[PDB]
Design a protein around this ligand. Structure first.
Ligand SMILES: [K+]
Ligand SMILES: [K+]
Ligand SMILES: [K+]
Ligand SMILES: [Mg+2]
Ligand SMILES: [Mg+2]
Ligand SMILES: [Mg+2]
Ligand SMILES: [Mg+2]
Ligand SMILES: [Mg+2]
Ligand SMILES: [Mg+2]
Ligand SMILES: [Mg+2]
Ligand SMILES: [Mg+2]
Ligand SMILES: [Mg+2]
Ligand SMILES: [Mg+2]
Ligand SMILES: [Mg+2]
Ligand SMILES: [Mg+2]
Lengths: 108, 113, 176, 72
RNA sequence: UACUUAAAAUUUAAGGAGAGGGUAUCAAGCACAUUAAAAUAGCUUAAGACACCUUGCCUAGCCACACCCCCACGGGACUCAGCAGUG
RNA sequence: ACUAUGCUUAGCCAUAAACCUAAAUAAUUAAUUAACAAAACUAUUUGCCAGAGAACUACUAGCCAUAGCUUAAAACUCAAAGGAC
């Protein structure tokens, strides 16, 4: 672009930073609604443990539960955090182990 | 004989319109530095000026004097002088009529007409 | 039309000043070298020369803005006559509109440099010059319809104020 | 120089043309109603002007033109 | 705080060299002008008007707000956005 | 085999790989090989571009256009897509 064209337009317009599943917040608190299994998109093979939750904002999201074995059930309370599960498409939230009803993984 | 408050005590511009009665719309331009590019560009402003004799024509360079009291909401200047008349320029250096970069009357001659 | 059209008996521009000097020339020879046995292009060289004499101070010069404007006025009037018979000729319709625009451009430069010649040229050639409008106005059915109401609404509001002023002044006059 | 990018656009346009053909009658009714709402919005915007100006009735001899109807 | 007349601090009103967030799929706004016999038909705008959306900024500090209705005669759902404290 | 149609006369429609896939203009040919194509490169002015797909799409506005054209997004998905050899 010419110097006249750079002057008439100025600095590049910056698209706004749209928020993610946590809505620009470190964590959210949600109530478990259902516990189910999700299948990782190929080339991976597993039965990943997930749960649906109703977040404090009022929306409902799918959250991956990390660790080997959880005791979560419906009506439990959990603290979710950000971070996508790479193989699980659409799962953009995770549960925090050791907060509210969710507990630390039982060591073997 | 206190002078005007406005910063533009004296402004030069081009008469871009003359459709209001006894008023000439004048476009002045100033140089403003682009901070990113550090280059000067033309910022233009519009000034309404009182043309008492309706002696202004579109395209002529004029000098405006700030009025002591604003005549109206937008008329805060008067026509001090017509520096260059449109198509009827008179060379300041020699005083002879010119039509562009040429003399309609040679400076060697002394017509005195 | 225009005040002057070259007569059929006029000689072409090549021999316009040569035949008069010759002592005696036959009627046939005068007819062969007249504008009757010539193309339309030759008749236009005579129209242009007549206008240059009647307008330009120095008709010997054809490179002045005033002369260039006269050259384009003859062409424009020629293209207009062409387009009156050839209604669907799109090449010449472009030639006509581009010459009109060229004349307007030259008239603008003439106005800014020699206003006195500009005024004479426009008066003699019968060409009206309109100044370029500062702002372009978009046009479409919705805009033209809203702009018509806005003008009408204003006029009605102002008419009511004028009537009120007359009634108010009339009442005051009666009291006095 | 392959034509792969042209083939993606080729399929999108083909499938879109068949979608419009299936729902041609539905799309017609959507448009006639979108134009009607477009006309009402135009009339209301013109009524706002004269009412704000202080007039209690539209200017004499004025009838809002119907500019979106099948006038041509 | 001085004098029978003047130096400050602090404000208010009318303004304007220049600068000053986003969307142009907000492109027209619709009285937004001038003159001063009251006529003329003008004014703003792609050099971004107008409309909408978002945001305290200018940081020795400044600006706005003070239960709500922009205001607060009035009306209303009738007061901790002073300190600590509670739901 | 035979239509619409290609033809004429009026009007509409305004789209092409409408592609020399080369904006225009004035210089230079050396103090210059990403590849391929069409040797390199400077200056001036305007237009345009800012990962891929979604998308020659949705909505908006204009239009003789009504299964239309021009204008033209986002959510969401992906870690590539793409060019040359
Ligand atoms: K694997
Ligand atoms: K308030
Ligand atoms: K080609
Ligand atoms: Mg597709
Ligand atoms: Mg839109
Ligand atoms: Mg209050
Ligand atoms: Mg409170
Ligand atoms: Mg209080
Ligand atoms: Mg407190
Ligand atoms: Mg046939
Ligand atoms: Mg195209
Ligand atoms: Mg071709
Ligand atoms: Mg297309
Ligand atoms: Mg479309
Ligand atoms: Mg559309």
């Amino acid at each position: 672009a010419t110097l006249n064209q750079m002057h008439r337009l100025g600095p590049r317009k910056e698209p706004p930073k749209r928020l993610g599943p946590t809505e620009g917040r470190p964590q959210l608190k949600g109530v478990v609604l259902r516990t189910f299994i999700r299948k990782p998109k190929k080339p991976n093979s597993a039965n990943r443990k997930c749960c649906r939750v109703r977040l404090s904002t009022g929306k409902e999201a799918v959250c991956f539960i990390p660790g080997e074995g959880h005791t979560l059930q419906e009506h439990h309370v959990v603290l979710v955090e950000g971070g996508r599960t790479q193989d699980l498409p659409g799962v953009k939230l995770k549960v925090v182990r050791g907060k509210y009803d969710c507990g630390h993984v039982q060591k073997k | 004989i206190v002078r005007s408050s406005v910063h533009a005590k004296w402004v030069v511009g081009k008469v871009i319109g003359t459709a209001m009665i006894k008023t000439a719309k004048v476009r002045a331009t100033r140089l403003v530095l682009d901070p990113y590019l550090l280059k000067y560009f033309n910022k233009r402003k519009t000034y309404f000026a009182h043309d008492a004799l309706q002696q202004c024509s579109v395209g002529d360079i004029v000098l405006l004097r700030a009025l002591p009291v604003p005549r109206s909401k937008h008329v805060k200047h008067e026509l001090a002088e017509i520096i260059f008349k449109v198509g009827r320029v008179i060379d300041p250096v020699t005083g002879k009529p010119c039509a562009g970069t040429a003399y309609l009357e040679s400076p060697l001659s002394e017509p005195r007409e | 039309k225009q005040d002057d059209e070259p007569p059929s008996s006029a000689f072409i521009k090549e021999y316009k000043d040569i035949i008069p000097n010759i002592e005696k020339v036959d009627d046939v020879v005068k007819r062969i070298l007249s504008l009757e046995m010539a193309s339309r292009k030759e008749k236009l060289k005579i129209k242009q020369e007549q206008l240059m004499n009647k307008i330009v101070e120095n008709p010997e010069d054809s490179r002045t803005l005033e002369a260039q404007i006269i050259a384009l006025t003859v062409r424009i009037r020629n293209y207009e006559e062409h387009m009156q018979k050839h209604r669907k000729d799109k090449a010449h319709k472009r030639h006509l509109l581009m010459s009109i625009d060229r004349r307007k451009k030259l008239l603008k430069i003439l106005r800014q440099t020699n206003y006195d010649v500009f005024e004479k040229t426009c008066k003699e050639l019968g060409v009206e010059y309109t100044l370029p409008p500062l702002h372009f106005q978009k046009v479409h059915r919705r805009f033209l319809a809203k702009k018509a109401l806005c003008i009408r609404v204003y006029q009605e509001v102002q008419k009511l104020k004028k009537q009120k002023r007359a009634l108010k002044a009339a009442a005051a006059a009666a009291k006095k | 120089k392959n034509v792969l990018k042209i083939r993606r656009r080729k399929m999108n346009h083909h499938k879109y043309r068949k979608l419009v053909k299936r729902t041609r009658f539905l799309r017609r009714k959507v448009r006639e109603g979108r134009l009607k709402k477009k006309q009402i919005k135009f009339e209301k915007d013109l009524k706002r002007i004269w009412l704000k100006a202080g007039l209690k009735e539209a200017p004499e001899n004025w009838q809002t033109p119907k500019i979106y109807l099948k006038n041509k």
